[PDB]
Design an enzyme around this catalytic site. Structure first.
Site, PDB file in Angstrom:
ATOM      1  CE1 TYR A  77      23.194 -25.390  11.862  1.00  0.00           C
ATOM      2  CE2 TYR A  77      24.248 -23.279  12.458  1.00  0.00           C
ATOM      3  CZ  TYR A  77      24.318 -24.661  12.284  1.00  0.00           C
ATOM      4  OH  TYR A  77      25.444 -25.326  12.625  1.00  0.00           O
ATOM      5  CB  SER A  78      16.807 -22.737   6.959  1.00  0.00           C
ATOM      6  OG  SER A  78      17.757 -23.045   5.960  1.00  0.00           O
ATOM      7  CB  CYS A 254      15.413 -26.311   1.389  1.00  0.00           C
ATOM      8  SG  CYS A 254      16.578 -25.632   2.604  1.00  0.00           S
ATOM      9  CD  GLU A 294      18.650 -21.934   2.407  1.00  0.00           C
ATOM     10  OE1 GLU A 294      18.206 -20.746   2.196  1.00  0.00           O
ATOM     11  OE2 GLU A 294      18.429 -22.590   3.433  1.00  0.00           O
ATOM     12  CE1 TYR A 296      21.922 -28.209   5.052  1.00  0.00           C
ATOM     13  CE2 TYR A 296      20.505 -26.547   4.035  1.00  0.00           C
ATOM     14  CZ  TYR A 296      20.695 -27.570   4.951  1.00  0.00           C
ATOM     15  OH  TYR A 296      19.705 -28.032   5.766  1.00  0.00           O
TER      16      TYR A 296
HETATM   17  C1  LIG Z   1      22.020 -21.607   3.896  1.00  0.00           C
HETATM   18  C2  LIG Z   1      22.338 -22.704   4.883  1.00  0.00           C
HETATM   19  C3  LIG Z   1      21.348 -23.279   5.637  1.00  0.00           C
HETATM   20  C4  LIG Z   1      21.676 -24.282   6.512  1.00  0.00           C
HETATM   21  N1  LIG Z   1      20.651 -24.783   7.227  1.00  0.00           N
HETATM   22  C5  LIG Z   1      20.971 -25.719   8.087  1.00  0.00           C
HETATM   23  C6  LIG Z   1      19.942 -26.317   8.889  1.00  0.00           C
HETATM   24  O1  LIG Z   1      18.840 -25.878   8.979  1.00  0.00           O
HETATM   25  N2  LIG Z   1      20.333 -27.337   9.675  1.00  0.00           N
HETATM   26  C7  LIG Z   1      21.608 -27.923   9.691  1.00  0.00           C
HETATM   27  O2  LIG Z   1      21.795 -28.884  10.396  1.00  0.00           O
HETATM   28  N3  LIG Z   1      22.566 -27.389   8.887  1.00  0.00           N
HETATM   29  C8  LIG Z   1      22.226 -26.370   8.113  1.00  0.00           C
HETATM   30  N4  LIG Z   1      23.220 -25.862   7.365  1.00  0.00           N
HETATM   31  C9  LIG Z   1      24.558 -26.491   7.549  1.00  0.00           C
HETATM   32  C10 LIG Z   1      25.335 -25.736   8.698  1.00  0.00           C
HETATM   33  O3  LIG Z   1      25.592 -24.396   8.257  1.00  0.00           O
HETATM   34  C11 LIG Z   1      26.678 -26.347   9.117  1.00  0.00           C
HETATM   35  O4  LIG Z   1      27.512 -26.481   7.950  1.00  0.00           O
HETATM   36  C12 LIG Z   1      26.526 -27.711   9.731  1.00  0.00           C
HETATM   37  O5  LIG Z   1      25.719 -27.591  10.932  1.00  0.00           O
HETATM   38  C13 LIG Z   1      27.918 -28.299  10.071  1.00  0.00           C
HETATM   39  O6  LIG Z   1      28.785 -27.244  10.561  1.00  0.00           O
HETATM   40  P1  LIG Z   1      29.602 -27.626  11.930  1.00  0.00           P
HETATM   41  O7  LIG Z   1      30.224 -26.313  12.395  1.00  0.00           O
HETATM   42  O8  LIG Z   1      28.884 -28.602  12.808  1.00  0.00           O
HETATM   43  O9  LIG Z   1      30.768 -28.453  11.107  1.00  0.00           O
HETATM   44  P2  LIG Z   1      32.344 -27.984  10.825  1.00  0.00           P
HETATM   45  O10 LIG Z   1      33.094 -28.061  12.110  1.00  0.00           O
HETATM   46  O11 LIG Z   1      32.334 -26.823   9.954  1.00  0.00           O
HETATM   47  O12 LIG Z   1      32.684 -29.302   9.947  1.00  0.00           O
HETATM   48  C14 LIG Z   1      32.436 -29.048   8.535  1.00  0.00           C
HETATM   49  C15 LIG Z   1      33.441 -29.787   7.710  1.00  0.00           C
HETATM   50  O13 LIG Z   1      33.156 -31.195   7.960  1.00  0.00           O
HETATM   51  C16 LIG Z   1      33.771 -31.917   6.845  1.00  0.00           C
HETATM   52  N5  LIG Z   1      32.977 -33.144   6.666  1.00  0.00           N
HETATM   53  C17 LIG Z   1      31.602 -33.323   6.823  1.00  0.00           C
HETATM   54  N6  LIG Z   1      31.262 -34.611   6.727  1.00  0.00           N
HETATM   55  C18 LIG Z   1      32.443 -35.259   6.478  1.00  0.00           C
HETATM   56  C19 LIG Z   1      32.738 -36.650   6.183  1.00  0.00           C
HETATM   57  N7  LIG Z   1      31.820 -37.602   6.164  1.00  0.00           N
HETATM   58  N8  LIG Z   1      34.059 -36.906   5.926  1.00  0.00           N
HETATM   59  C20 LIG Z   1      35.032 -35.940   5.948  1.00  0.00           C
HETATM   60  N9  LIG Z   1      34.833 -34.663   6.189  1.00  0.00           N
HETATM   61  C21 LIG Z   1      33.543 -34.384   6.457  1.00  0.00           C
HETATM   62  C22 LIG Z   1      33.861 -30.981   5.666  1.00  0.00           C
HETATM   63  O14 LIG Z   1      35.269 -30.872   5.402  1.00  0.00           O
HETATM   64  C23 LIG Z   1      33.315 -29.624   6.202  1.00  0.00           C
HETATM   65  O15 LIG Z   1      33.906 -28.444   5.704  1.00  0.00           O
HETATM   66  C24 LIG Z   1      22.993 -24.820   6.510  1.00  0.00           C
HETATM   67  C25 LIG Z   1      24.000 -24.287   5.722  1.00  0.00           C
HETATM   68  C26 LIG Z   1      23.666 -23.239   4.891  1.00  0.00           C
HETATM   69  C27 LIG Z   1      24.656 -22.623   3.946  1.00  0.00           C
END
Ligand SMILES: Cc1cc2nc3c(=O)[nH]c(=O)nc-3n(C[C@H](O)[C@H](O)[C@H](O)COP(=O)(O)OP(=O)(O)OC[C@H]3O[C@@H](n4cnc5c(N)ncnc54)[C@H](O)[C@@H]3O)c2cc1C
Length: 296
Positions: A77-78, A254, A294, A296
């Site tokens: 998360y940034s 970003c 950046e 994602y």
């Molecule tokens: C460098 C970096 C910075 C980030 N900064 C932030 C930030 O500041 N704030 C933020 O909110 N996030 C940010 N993210 C995103 C964050 O890391 C997570 O990926 C995000 O919060 C979702 O992860 P989760 O564990 O909730 O979802 P998970 O349980 O990992 O679910 C993710 C999966 O959902 C699936 N998916 C998503 N949408 C759909 C759809 N419509 N249909 C089907 N499949 C779907 C994909 O298969 C994906 O792999 C950042 C990511 C990176 C790399």
């Protein structure tokens, strides 16, 4: 040789096998009820143990186990707060998190793991953090730089970090005197993040800060096109283009991966009109640390 503030950064002081355990101080929903999906601003205590810099990220390990009994993989998360933090004492860290909900193949609703864990946190809950991670998004050293920031949705987080340092804090060795220009693309007005803080910064440094919002579902251009970020940028094509040609101009982008294409699409056209191949020019900017991404 860095043009960015890379000196003395900390990286991976805490790791997935030995995370730092902080506690939630506050967690507020910052989008309105209209908004498609929620975004929360949460603040955690770290007691000064995570010495991050503006532009960096932290990793979060959501509680529980994966389908194999192992710990969940971290999510990044940034950081959305400047190095001193929202309380100005350097002991807190803030995140901007969109709650992820989707439906799978069978039509069943699926909550994303880390996002729902974070958005559900209560003051006092503990949370496992790793990091700090990152060098790509550090600020430029030059205090008179032209900084253009292009964010979508949660991608506003590192620019909030920057802007607090530039405009809401007093530092002994840093006084911003350039021009900061933020473009923020969101779908609804109810999805505008931190607008109120940016409006105060504008009042404060009217000559040093420019602000433009692109609210896609509610705004259109003359053609009647949806106001996406590239759509709002184009309205200043001449100006931006001119800025891009100066050596002290730095671009940061970003947010959602998708934003990259529509911007390249505007640029390709601006450049060619000038006899410039955007693909090569962009490569040269990336090499000179002027085009920083950046998504994602
Ligand atoms: C460098 C970096 C910075 C980030 N900064 C932030 C930030 O500041 N704030 C933020 O909110 N996030 C940010 N993210 C995103 C964050 O890391 C997570 O990926 C995000 O919060 C979702 O992860 P989760 O564990 O909730 O979802 P998970 O349980 O990992 O679910 C993710 C999966 O959902 C699936 N998916 C998503 N949408 C759909 C759809 N419509 N249909 C089907 N499949 C779907 C994909 O298969 C994906 O792999 C950042 C990511 C990176 C790399």
């Amino acid at each position: 040789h860095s043009k960015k503030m890379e000196e003395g950064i900390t990286v991976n002081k805490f790791k997935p096998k030995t995370p730092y355990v902080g506690r939630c101080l506050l967690n507020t929903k910052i989008t309105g009820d209209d908004a498609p999906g929620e975004t929360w601003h949460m603040v955690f205590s770290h007691e000064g143990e995570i010495p991050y810099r503006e532009g960096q990220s932290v990793g979060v390990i959501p509680d529980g186990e994966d389908k194999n009994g192992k710990p969940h993989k971290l999510r990044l998360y940034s950081i959305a707060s400047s190095a001193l933090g929202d309380f100005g004492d350097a002991k807190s860290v803030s995140l901007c998190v969109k709650r992820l909900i989707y439906t799978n193949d069978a039509g069943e609703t699926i909550k994303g793991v880390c996002s729902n864990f974070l958005c559900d946190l209560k003051p006092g809950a503990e949370v496992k953090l790793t990091g700090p991670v990152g060098k790509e998004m550090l600020m430029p050293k030059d205090p008179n730089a032209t900084i253009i920031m292009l964010g979508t949705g949660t991608g506003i987080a590192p620019f909030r970090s920057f802007l607090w340092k530039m405009f809401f804090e007093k530092h002994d060795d840093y006084k911003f005197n350039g021009l900061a220009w933020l473009f923020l693309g969101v779908p609804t007005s109810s999805s505008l993040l931190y607008k109120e803080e940016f409006e105060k910064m504008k009042e404060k440094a009217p000559d040093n800060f420019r602000l433009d919002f692109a609210v896609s579902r509610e705004q259109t251009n003359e053609k009647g096109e949806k106001m996406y970020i590239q759509t709002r940028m184009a309205q200043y094509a001449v100006e931006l283009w001119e800025m891009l040609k100066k050596d002290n101009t730095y671009v940061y982008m970003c947010g959602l991966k998708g934003m990259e294409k529509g911007i390249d699409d505007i640029m390709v056209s601006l450049a060619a009109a000038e006899g410039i191949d955007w693909i090569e020019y962009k490569r040269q900017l990336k090499k000179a640390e002027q085009w920083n991404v950046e998504v994602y």
